[PDB]
Symmetry: D2
Subunit: 276 residues, 4 copies
């Protein structure tokens, strides 16, 4: 198994039997003949379903609630004995226009949560118009939504969807939430929107240019990435390193499925092995 | 020429007190909290408006009675910090803010909760060093977990409405209300079955230290306790012991017994002298906030508007509505 | 009446006591600009800090109140439109010499925190991470330390560095103290393991530490700046820092500090592009221009300010401009 | 044959080559850092200089004799200057955009009475630094009265020193030397520095002297009860030690995890010396 983490070995250890290091960076990365992908010529390839969407809709709200209630700020103030609540005032989500971009299973669940906090949940998707959301056009979402959260994949025209112009059309004070893909956001324009005060906040789980940075302990150096250092510096940014999947259920499932997938290709190397 | 001084003023407050919304006209504001060292700032004011960070004991009230103060406009629901009996012997009316935003408290409770389960407090500190390793940062899906709400007023109902949208099985206990949003069970069933417990009840003399050693022994191993209600409900020593031992998975706290002079104040010059607060903050399965569940624009607007209403209304008649 | 803008408790603890009763006194922690100049109405003396902005507009408003004295609680008149104040007729007075012992001590403090990697350990331990990896430094013993500028501050820093076992080189075209091996600047630049600047800023000094200067310094070297932020090109420092050519930087001053330092920006965070990148770097250490922030030096600033106001009548003062 | 290995040791142990034998070094608490009866058959490359254990080789039973005393006297002052100049506090403020210098005021060391307890090589080096900062340096030692220090009685150091730093070994009479009584006797506002031994201080009474405000500050690299805590990453749990959590939470405490030796010169010496000592026992 390639990029192995201890949070996988807790689940992936007791369920592996029969025949038989795991140095990170032969399974996944997010020579028998099978590559066991763990995301969501022929050189036999498989993949993991499920991958728990709940863990990502939960994180999405967690990160967005942390930002609006400024739990990142309070954390550092209370460590210092500074219990003055200045700069930690947020808003009630109740009555706020929540905007969901991408109405697959993660966007839907997020709209389910957002609905319960008392938001008016707008949403946009070229296919499916779910009941959970007042489906509207993208431009209307962009300009009317107090909160936008991105739950769509990254396509050639999706890149930098949030850029200097989208930031200009957005409601002043708006929170932008992204646990989908970092490429959907022009980090430079996001920092300029955040610094100038047009964008009220941002809560990111993903980051264009995250590749060699996330999932690794760079503690001996520090932050060499210029944009990451600026994101973490602003009070109105919350950021986590692509951990929106990291739940016991999701990992136990990723781990248990990966084992079955091998157990399927060795019980019969010629097949559809479910998640080919 | 009617003079009102505001003690323990904050920017998040003065920005929402309208202009001032002239209740009475002459207005002085200080960020400084009220005690014997500052009471004389109140000379000439008939109204003194306070926050929980202010101390109005006997000595301070005797000094306010002799400056002509007639009204104490408490910018809070709590009146713990006021010697009410002495102020009623002096003739000073006390008025409070009785209704915050219930949505603000519910929303903070969830925030505080997901912060703990997704280990956001640990990630915060990890990434500032460049440690983007995810070991130590795994949580669990609220989906399917059993969530137990204690106290089923609007706060508790709103908290249960949120949790149900995360996939939670929501249990609740409350002898005086049985809402449809919850499977009403018994308190012992909530204690023993719940993955996550959230408290949303007042404090009574039978309530005090409800979460004690025995209560922690009966809760499910690895359980999450969340307290935005009142810090008295939890025995902090026992909580610290249950947390260091592994029995309790985590705690998320907005309130703390012994907060009655620590919270709401910048103790930056010293640090954390409190023995229990220090051990709490260094623990990886604890999230903690300084009683900020109410700290939203919408709730602060309410508090200020109401305080303006309470002074505008005050005319020596015990129909002060929000009198105590 | 005397009004004090940008008052601090570490200041009022010292000038407050007795405060030789020159008329009625008012203090605000708030800093002076056009939104707050009103508080100076009725005052004849306005006392400032470097967090206060007194440009043309604000001086024309003060002049119209009868203010006749600017009591600057600092050495720098950088934040005062001096020519407009001299055209309006407002006298300006300052505190010329802090304590130099305080600057020298803070220089060494900030240096030893960088070299012993206390900033990293600080954050490590708070998480319960007592693993010493990433925390190794080196002995000051036998290292070559280069001091640039040899006034009392520079001399007092060499006096300290020599007690850590350091070989102390120094450059200064004026005076050659015995505490130091006087060398040429290029020898200091190329040979020093640790460099500490303690000179003023000239128009020929500006960005003295640029890319070229960083290319010429010894691989792995520690630079230290308690003097003036102008002397270092921050962009080049950041590049030298991210590449490994520069072992580290410890900084008390920063170009473009002139509106950021000395103010609580907690509500926002760090908007400055360079500050965020500096703080995220593990070989930095940075402080908010607090080299002077000792009781002894602060007592000096307040006493000298009291002396300056009491002295003010109408003749050119000891510390006029 | 190498136990309790750290990467800062591996940087140096390896280039010098331990080996053309096979050795292998796995870290876990014959290679014996500070971090037993039932020893099986044997054949002790301590890589230390301490008595954490009960041909005549040049360093005997094989420890590292020399070390770096500068590493510890440098760290001693670093820690001490960090606390007086409140660099821990500023570290956490500036991360927030909070550049207000309130609560970071220090004092000039110049003119302050510095007090050194134990006047061997670390204390002497420490007093040399301390002398250059402008301090009047006192010192106490039962043997030797160096001129670097105005030698005085222990009681006179305790009560007159603005700054105390401990540089003596821990003896069965020395345990809890800094207790409730010593803290009543010390000067109001004094800084206490300990890079020697944690047992020399009663942490509980230190926490009370600090909380009460009798003690102006404390700067520790060593801590009684540090054993299973220091040199280990406890990031998954938090800080379970009640006294450590309280120490870390005060603004007038600086603490570091026994890192006063961690310098390149010190570790290269410990590494080169260990190798030399094995090369001396194989040529017996």
């Amino acid at each position: 198994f390639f990029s192995m983490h201890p949070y996988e070995e807790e689940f992936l250890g007791p369920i592996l039997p029969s025949d038989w290091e795991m140095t990170p960076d032969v399974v996944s990365l997010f020579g028998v003949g099978l590559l066991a992908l763990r995301s969501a010529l022929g050189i036999k390839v498989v993949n993991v379903p499920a991958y728990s969407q709940h863990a990502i809709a939960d994180h999405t709200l967690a990160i967005m609630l942390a930002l609006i209630r400024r739990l990142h700020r309070a954390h550092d103030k209370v460590r210092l004995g500074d219990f003055d609540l200045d700069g930690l005032m947020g808003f009630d989500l109740n009555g706020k226009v929540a905007g969901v971009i991408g109405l697959g299973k993660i966007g839907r669940l997020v709209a389910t949560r957002l609905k319960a906090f008392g938001c008016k949940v707008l949403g946009y998707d070229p296919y499916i118009q779910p009941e959970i959301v007042e489906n509207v056009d993208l431009d209307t979402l962009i300009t009317q939504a107090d909160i936008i959260s991105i739950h769509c994949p990254l396509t050639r025209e999706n890149f930098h969807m949030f850029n200097e112009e989208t930031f200009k059309r957005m409601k002043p004070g708006a929170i932008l939430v992204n646990t989908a893909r970092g490429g959907l956001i022009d980090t430079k324009a996001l920092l300029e929107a955040l610094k100038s005060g047009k964008l009220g906040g941002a809560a990111l789980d993903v980051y264009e240019y995250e590749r060699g940075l996330f999932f690794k302990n760079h503690q001996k150096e520090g932050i060499k990435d210029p944009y990451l250092a600026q994101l973490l510096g602003l009070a109105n940014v919350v950021l986590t390193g692509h951990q929106a999947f990291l739940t016991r259920e999701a990992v136990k499932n990723i781990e248990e499925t990966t084992v079955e997938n091998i157990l399927e290709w060795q019980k019969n190397p010629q097949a559809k092995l479910k998640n080919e």
